[PDB]
Symmetry: C3
């Protein structure tokens, strides 16, 4: 009656509250909550990024536009000349050449008190690579730089003889990309690169900031290469599927031949523009499990040099921010909270449950 | 005797230790502990700040001081000229004018592979605003910029004809303030602004760092607008209550007329200085629940322009630090810890407590 | 039989699982896990670092090398002249003098609206200090600057008469070190200092980032001074134990006399170099419990000055990152987890254990 009814009410209230708490915990585990731990991991060997050093886009280029005007065309219609038998799109995109052979990058690491800065010229030297911006040079930046001092830079240089044989370049475009993803160089160097003047010797400082996202069912992260591969394939195919044609331009990898018709070359170029502008939205990939963020700030330099193009990139800060989205609510945590709630709104343990099971088996 | 006494001692020891633990937890709840979670929230649309671009203070101004000397006064006593019938303090503070009509700011966002930076001149254009520094221009920066590339800037310009009709300005002062807080522009632009020369076309970069403080009884936070209203009202009334007079100067909002006596104008100016210097201490309000921190670092530019005043403000970094001081020890946390401690130094649950209550009711 | 055997199996399973959990918790406490809390502590009084402003290393020095060539030596063998009776290594290292007497540094903090920047020249003035780089000047930077505005700098200057009596210096070397740690200035100023030209008046901005490491058995942290003392002692004695000689050069503390033989002076200089490049490895100390990281970024200035050497160091950012590695698994945490696991896989409380003890005592 009274007593039994109230006892049943209380017991059912206890089970109801425990079940509601456990259900909320279970629903919390299904949607993995994520927190971020940010620490500064000082490393002695800095992983230098792979600098891309492009000229300004053909339209904004000085020397290439000068050649196009010499042939008698305006700053726009240089693709109305490629299928001319000798210009051979390869030789059109060789007219954007802003760097000459002598390009070489050194890797100064220390400072020394007798000799001076440790000039180490055996580091991976730069190679010329085609890009939407034209014909650039990619800085491999392969081996790591042993950070010792605030004077730890790679000094790119080019001693192109600047005699009055033809007008000479005004500025270049610098983009700091990651080791071996080919879409960063050949496509995204006209957008994400800094336009800086070669008239005077210009420097940089780079502080590295790394964001890491954990694998998670409702927000997955792919490794370094797989995102690059998916994005590059998307960009190359939709150029084809958005130009509704079949041919390529130097910045594309050798799938098909080189557009033996100017209208199709223009279609490819325009589709490239349209897809590169907004491949973040149209794509279906997500940021890597790592995310390098180079905080590139400028500086003045300590000495002049009569060199056509000069460039320093300082890495004086060896403490790198490391954000790491991580697993904050594990399955062990769920089981422990379930145990806590069943032992807090009750007296049930993992020994009483087995004891009742034993009683069931008589 | 022995056994009963020791049993009572043990029971009271357990009960007392549990009570001490619960009391410490309760006292931990009253003084809300606060932790901070720092994450990088990459946004595609950067919320550009409202740039204020003032000339140097009258004393340090070039052209205004030249006018004052022409009238036959020193670079301190220009307030001994305002109540002259025609100079009409408004027309005294129109002599600080460093910008001319033509002022217009554009918003380059993309980079493009043919055209170049996407010039979008339809954005909020700048308007002239009076300030303690004189007559300035405030950059509304209303619409957000769709971050795409590291070339995403708003370029302020002014093509004032620099003919030899009168000496021309040397430098300006830029202050980066939030959308619609009127105390920032009119008062705190002579203090918190960067003094940078207009001789050469200069550029800026800005990385946003946002600190969020949680509402908390012993350290409250007000929203964006309320703190600005508090500070502005305090600054304006104290100028009045610290000058012990009743009149205003152009930078103050239209409460009272324009100081038809030079001594009171000087009183107002001096009180304004003395209050803006130290309104942080005398005030009785606390920083917002949000706290935008623009990390303004300098750089060089990629192209010259024969324009009287030229300015770029780059926004190449979309990852923004977000510190969020938050509630770390909730009321549910206190209840669960109380349950844990009463079930760890005892065998009491919310089913045994109700059972004992039922036993009490017989 | 059946029932008793299964009951024993269940009881032993519960005991084993509880013991495994408790052992894992205990081993988790023995290897203290460490997490980092990063908050921005708005500080009104910025603790300015102790700037060291050295000339470039002797061989890279202009004026000192000019003197060496005048005496008839190359820019390497200036130590083949020290024990000449009058050059008296002290007077060899007085030839690197790049600053003249008139050196004085001010501390501008505010901006003001009438007067202008608050020049406060009574702050600690600079003194000349010997260093491997030569004869430098050290900026005491003793009192803190009351941060008020984005114009809070200490402007170093030197008005040495630049008449055509002798060729004049090209650049200096700036190194930002902590208040009273003597191994920084005298040894690590040729390595960790920025080489920046004096030709034009340059400015600096510095944002402070502080990393704190908690004292911990398997990775101890010493206070600010003890690490500096240990590193200085190691560097100075190894120079002696690595040069296998007994004498010193001006940058060393007055332990022994000044190397009255050039071969020993060269031995000391070479041993110095060799140890300073790699004292991080050979030493046996670890980073302090403090770690100040000055984020020195460059910029332009607001006004020229016909001064031989001019320098600003802006401190416009009062929000300082404070990473604090801390104790995440306390002893109370271990005890509470042990209680939770023994009350979750069992029904044991701290009252039932005492009850069983009482039963033992009959």
């Amino acid at each position: 009656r009274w007593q039994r009814a109230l006892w049943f009410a209380g017991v059912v209230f206890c089970f109801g509250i425990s079940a509601h708490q456990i259900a909320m915990h279970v629903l919390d585990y299904l949607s993995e909550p994520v927190a971020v731990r940010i620490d500064f991991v000082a490393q002695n060997e800095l992983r230098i990024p792979e600098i891309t050093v492009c000229p300004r886009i053909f339209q904004q280029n000085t020397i290439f536009t000068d050649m196009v005007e010499k042939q008698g065309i305006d700053k726009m219609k240089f693709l109305d000349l490629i299928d001319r038998p000798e210009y051979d799109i390869m030789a059109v995109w060789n007219l954007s050449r802003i760097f000459s052979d002598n390009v070489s990058c050194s890797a100064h690491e220390g400072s020394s008190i007798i000799s001076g800065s440790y000039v180490d010229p055996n580091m991976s030297q730069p190679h010329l690579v085609y890009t939407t911006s034209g014909q650039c040079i990619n800085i491999p930046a392969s081996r790591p730089l042993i950070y010792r001092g605030v004077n730890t830079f790679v000094r790119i240089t080019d001693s192109q003889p600047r005699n009055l044989d033809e007008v000479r370049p005004e500025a270049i475009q610098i983009y700091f990309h990651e080791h071996h993803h080919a879409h960063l160089s050949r496509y995204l160097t006209g957008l994400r690169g800094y336009i800086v003047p070669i008239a005077n010797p210009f420097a940089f400082s780079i502080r590295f900031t790394q964001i890491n996202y954990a694998n998670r069912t409702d927000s997955p992260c792919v490794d370094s290469e797989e995102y690059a591969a998916c994005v590059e394939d998307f960009i190359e195919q939709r150029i084809y599927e958005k130009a509704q044609v079949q041919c390529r331009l130097p910045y594309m990898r050798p799938k098909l031949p080189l557009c033996s018709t100017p209208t199709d070359a223009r279609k490819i170029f325009v589709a490239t523009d349209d897809v590169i502008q907004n491949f973040e939205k149209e794509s279906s990939c997500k940021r890597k499990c790592e995310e390098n963020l180079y905080i590139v700030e400028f500086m003045h330099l300590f000495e002049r040099s009569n060199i056509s193009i000069d460039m320093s990139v300082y890495f004086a800060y060896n403490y790198i921010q490391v954000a790491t989205e991580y697993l904050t609510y594990t399955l062990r945590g769920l089981l422990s909270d379930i145990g806590g709630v069943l032992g807090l709104f009750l007296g049930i343990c993992i020994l009483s449950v087995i004891e009742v099971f034993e009683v069931v088996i008589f």
